[PDB]
């Protein structure tokens, strides 16, 4: 079993498996949308991917990363934003529908956990133990990866301008 | 293994297991409280306990029953109200913050996913699978059932003058 370690403010914090550097297949995953409807990552065949991957999507941190990523999604190309984390699909759908964020599509963890696992991101030890760590990672059209964050630290945001291709 | 039969409107979803009938002997739970505590049942010793189970509490329903059993938790004697979902402890937070609700517990099953086993009350297919069936049980000091309901239909709300002893 692979490990990997990330911190909340300055706490090691062991998470399971590793995230797929460059050059590396990413696993075919399935999750849940806001309308309850399982989708797979083979429906956006065609289309680079941008997973933006965090613990919860009411803390302060995780907000403003699903607000910037909307924002930049119109100035994206052929590219769309998938928002997963350990919230239920209602959680999710109503942040977005309170802020009036259209343009990122929220996932679910709620049926298809084995994505923790495959994407090496799944929180081990401590307090934010069964949440998804802070994760970046940006795919193109055939799930090969173009680029993969591992955010050092929790509290502070990952590099928007830098997953660009 | 057993199977319990509800429905969302009018249409039939299986429930894993089944829950704890009058007489029976509680199991011993431990969730995530809204510190990322874990909290086990077995410090609510010599206290009664009212346990709400929903699947969210972003939902319709669910959100009404949290408000309800908040406003005569403080009628209760010798009587802690918890509310156990599958929601994240920030999801829960943010709406007993916001409603200004002090005298309910939230649990979040982030942490001891085992409780949906061992309370049956797990739901298996259709839409609403990972989540928690709508449950209403009631415990004495001693862990020992003295209410429980499934409610045969996710839509309507539980019977909160019933739970009374």
């Given at each position: 079993?692979?490990?990997?370690?990330?911190?909340?403010?300055?706490?090691?914090?062991?998470?399971?498996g590793?995230?797929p550097?460059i050059?590396?297949?990413?696993?075919?995953?399935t999750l849940?949308?806001?309308?309850?409807?399982d989708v797979?990552?083979?429906?956006?065949?065609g289309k680079?991917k941008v997973?933006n991957?965090?613990?919860?999507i009411?803390?302060?941190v995780?907000?403003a990363?699903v607000?910037?990523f909307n924002?930049?999604?119109?100035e994206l190309?052929?590219?769309?934003?998938?928002?997963?984390?350990?919230?239920?699909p209602?959680?999710?759908?109503?942040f977005?529908?309170?802020?009036?964020?259209?343009n990122?599509?929220?996932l679910?963890?709620?049926?298809?956990?084995?994505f923790?696992?495959?994407?090496?991101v799944?929180?081990?030890?401590?307090?934010l133990?069964?949440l998804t760590?802070?994760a970046?990672?940006v795919?193109?059209?055939?799930?090969?990866?173009?680029?993969?964050?591992?955010?050092?630290?929790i509290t502070?945001?990952p590099?928007?301008?830098?997953?660009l291709?």
């Open positions: 079993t692979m490990t990997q370690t990330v911190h909340f403010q300055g706490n090691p914090v062991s998470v399971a590793k995230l550097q050059g590396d297949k990413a696993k075919d995953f849940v949308a806001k309308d309850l409807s797979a990552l083979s429906s956006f065949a680079r997973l991957i965090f613990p919860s009411d803390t302060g995780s907000a990363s607000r910037k924002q930049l999604a119109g190309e052929n590219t769309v934003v998938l928002c997963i984390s350990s919230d239920l209602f959680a999710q759908s109503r977005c529908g309170a802020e009036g964020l259209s990122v599509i929220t679910s963890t709620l049926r298809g956990a084995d923790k696992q495959a994407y090496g799944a929180i081990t030890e401590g307090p133990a069964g760590a802070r970046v990672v795919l193109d059209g055939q799930d090969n990866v173009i680029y993969s964050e591992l955010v050092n630290e502070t945001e590099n928007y301008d830098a997953a291709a």
